[PDB]
Recover the amino acids of this structure.
């Protein structure tokens, strides 16, 4: 619906604060802003987004956005240099996919260890010593540690500590085929976690609300949660500290780093009003304070407002935990990774499967065999390998008038017969062309390739080759089909 | 350059009149309008258009626009119902390509027979009797007929009379493989034309300006030309009539029908100002009169201004000749057709080749083997043949709880294991997908496919399949490569 903004944001984040920014936007531009927090919005989005039940702006961590973008659900964002300099460049890095900017970076999230200072003046440096500490607190009618086991996000810091990883990065891209879910170190992490359930130290059933209300009512000594969760501990008036996670096997726990991002719906007719709201009303010391006051955002993208929160000890510990972690891949194969790791952790902790079986299946599910779709990078390699073959044929013709073989960035034209139109078969290596067509040049009477009239460019007609509209019309059909 | 309009239009059309409309536009919106008439603008366009040396608006006949559109050089035009009702629907038909509107129809052109009434009170009903009439006029120091032989556009009426054709139309599309350039009837037409050169009735060298200044100075009895050429005959004060072309072999001459169209450069940052100028300033009784006063447009698209010119006898004869002709295919394979037929006519009339050789080569050049690029139509056929196979597997599973195989407009999901995530390999028949990936559904505990949260749609994740962004990023690379 034109002339108003719908905004989806997670239900554990500061949506009431975001509403307050949207109130300010309505008073200043006369435009209604609706902030909504649906269950499972991250899987709700791709289906509904293109139906005008979807929002104008979606908030989530940067990992889901690779898939969204590749679904053609996000508009690309176009901020001017002046605005770009307001946010840390590494946050920009995170909302960058396939060389496009797909979102606005908001804040940087990382799991930390939150401990009850009064129940435990000194948080344990290692995971290994928790069993002993829990067995001690159980005697005092308490538990040592309780945290969301249902979500793979919270258990990963342990599973990644001794050697686990989502996808291997190398030479500036992710290997979708290489997954470190079932190596020696990951088994060590999950085996240890399963043992905690086995030995009655934790319950397998513990979900987000069970473990938070457990911590808030002083029933547990330690929780693992993110910045957003701090507001509730303050209301419950528990004397708490936020600290670096425990080491496992002398190796630091490696939490996934989330950059909360705001994306703009490609289907929204309110794109300009979206940009206007995000750049001028939300990403400002005031706007971020409003959200931050409701639930803490973590380390915000905005450099100016960041320097302020960067004196907060609770942030420092989130940043310390962020440096020790790994930033989540934002590639499309992530949703399979999450489903795989959820299944795995759930099955292992319940007993449905042994740790080794659970992870070996997760290995196979998460890991995708190479995409068969040709990427821009690969296409360019074929183009360079064809340019090469053109240097070669020109060097070999000249080694012993017709127009000379030349390379025009796409084809390699052969010796032209003077006065003639030269037809050359549209090159098979250009993935997108019609390889049955022909491209044309006029080779003039004197052995120079005819020129575009009154210009200094070589005339060539490629209209049999190019299928830009057809490719669109077809691909659009598949998109409409996927969405209506 | 933002905030002003550059307009390319042919040099034999009414560019001074179009300038006058552009003057009016500048006085009313404070926007500078430049009307330019470059040599060979129809082949100049594709190369320069994407360089900001190209125009905002290009005028040409509808045939070249298939190629332009497929080059992604034209913006699609979006006129409202109210405006669409102002122009005849068949002119709209002509500027329609692959189900998009790519231009604005301006006027309808057709070659006619122009005769000097004073040198010849009765124009010859047949082509056969011209030799006798010329041999008579030569004795009086004149010639019977002189017209542009250099361009295939003017010779085609004869070449298409006894059975020639560009591309066979069938079931609402052109067969690029089927060309009637070298059938029995086309040879008859070209043989006859070559005989006129042979027997000294016409000169092979006769180009556009030679033949018009010949007619205007009273040196020839008959010319073949279009509406645009009438203004000069009126200045030269020759008593002329415009009439239906001579029949050949008892068959009417079949001229190509051109719908002069105005297209908007996809690269232009002035698209809105383009639409504004074309809809409100040019396609109006006043605007078209201004152009029409400079050089006649033919039968204009605008119904209201058309009824006026539709009383002009000269138009009536163009319309009569239009009905007897064939409307030019606007497919991309046209430019090859033109190059093929030019070469052919040139070589035959000069003597470089015998008529049969000339046309058999034109046959091979003009005719393209089928496009290998999959079109939307074909992709849908594969989708329907996959839907079919789904009805089939559902009917055969039910012929003898799990979630039931069903068809979701793209894939056909197999029997689901209750409680499980169902992975299904991205379908190989979807040309645009990544056929290595997997699509996902949750089959719930009770044997119903899990639903998109709070909605009535079946949840499915296709993010491994879809490559909408990659396909763009890659194709864009090829476009930039073709243009810079
Ligand atoms: O649990 C898998 C889940 O992890 C991430 O979502 C986080 C989110 O980043 C946090 O802000 C917080 O609300 O917890 C969520 C998990 O409970 C991924 O972004 C998401 O795709 C994935 O499903
Ligand atoms: O002859 C090949 C040429 O024919 C057509 O162009 C015509 C044009 O439509 C007329 O309005 C007039 O100005 O003469 C032109 C050429 O004589 C085709 O439109 C064009 O593609 C083709 O090159």
């Amino acid at each position: 619906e034109e002339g108003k903004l719908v905004i989806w944001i997670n239900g554990d984040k500061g949506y009431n604060g975001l509403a307050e920014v949207g109130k300010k936007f309505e008073k200043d531009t006369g435009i209604k802003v609706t902030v909504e927090h649906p269950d499972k919005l991250e899987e709700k989005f791709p289906q509904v987004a293109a139906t005008g039940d979807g929002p104008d702006i979606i908030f989530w961590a940067h990992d889901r956005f690779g898939g969204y973008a590749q679904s053609g659900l996000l508009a690309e964002i176009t901020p001017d240099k002046a605005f770009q300099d307001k946010l840390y460049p590494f946050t920009w890095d995170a909302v960058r996919y396939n060389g496009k900017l797909i979102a606005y970076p908001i804040a940087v999230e990382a799991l930390s260890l939150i401990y009850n200072k009064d129940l435990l003046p000194n948080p344990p440096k290692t995971w290994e010593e928790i069993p002993a500490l829990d067995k001690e607190l159980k005697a005092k009618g308490k538990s040592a540690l309780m945290f969301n086991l249902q979500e793979p996000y919270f258990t990963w810091p342990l599973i990644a500590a001794d050697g686990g990883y989502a996808f291997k990065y190398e030479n500036g891209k992710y290997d979708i085929k290489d997954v470190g879910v079932d190596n020696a170190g990951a088994k060590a992490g999950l085996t240890f976690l399963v043992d905690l359930i086995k030995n009655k130290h934790m319950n397998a059933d513990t979900d987000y609300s069970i473990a938070e209300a457990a911590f808030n009512k002083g029933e547990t000594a330690m929780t693992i949660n993110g910045p957003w969760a701090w507001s509730n501990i303050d209301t419950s008036k528990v004397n708490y500290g936020v600290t670096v996670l425990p080491t496992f096997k002398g190796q630091p726990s490696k939490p996934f780093v989330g950059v909360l991002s705001a994306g703009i719906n490609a289907a929204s007719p309110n794109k300009e009003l979206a940009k206007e709201f995000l750049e001028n009303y939300l990403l400002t010391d005031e706007g971020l304070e409003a959200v931050n006051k409701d639930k803490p955002l973590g380390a915000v993208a905005l450099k100016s407002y960041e320097e302020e929160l960067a004196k907060d000890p609770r942030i420092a510990a989130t940043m310390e935990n962020a440096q020790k972690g790994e930033i989540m891949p934002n590639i499309p194969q992530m949703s399979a990774f999450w489903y795989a790791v959820r299944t795995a952790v759930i099955n292992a902790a319940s007993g449905r499967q042994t740790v080794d079986e659970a992870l070996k299946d997760a290995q196979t599910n998460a890991a995708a065999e190479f995409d068969d779709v040709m990427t821009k990078e690969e296409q360019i390699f074929l183009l360079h390998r064809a340019q090469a073959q053109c240097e070669k044929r020109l060097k070999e013709v000249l080694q012993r008038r017709p127009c000379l073989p030349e390379w025009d960035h796409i084809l390699c034209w052969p010796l032209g017969a003077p006065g003639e139109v030269v037809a050359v078969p549209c090159p098979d290596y250009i993935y997108d062309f019609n390889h049955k067509g022909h491209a044309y040049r006029r080779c003039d009477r004197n052995g120079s390739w005819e020129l575009v009239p009154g210009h200094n460019r070589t005339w060539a007609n490629y209209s049999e080759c190019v299928k830009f509209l057809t490719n669109e019309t077809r691909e659009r059909e598949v998109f409409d089909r996927l969405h209506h």
About this structure: The longest helix of chain B spans residues 376-397. Chain B has two domains: 1-371, 372-484.
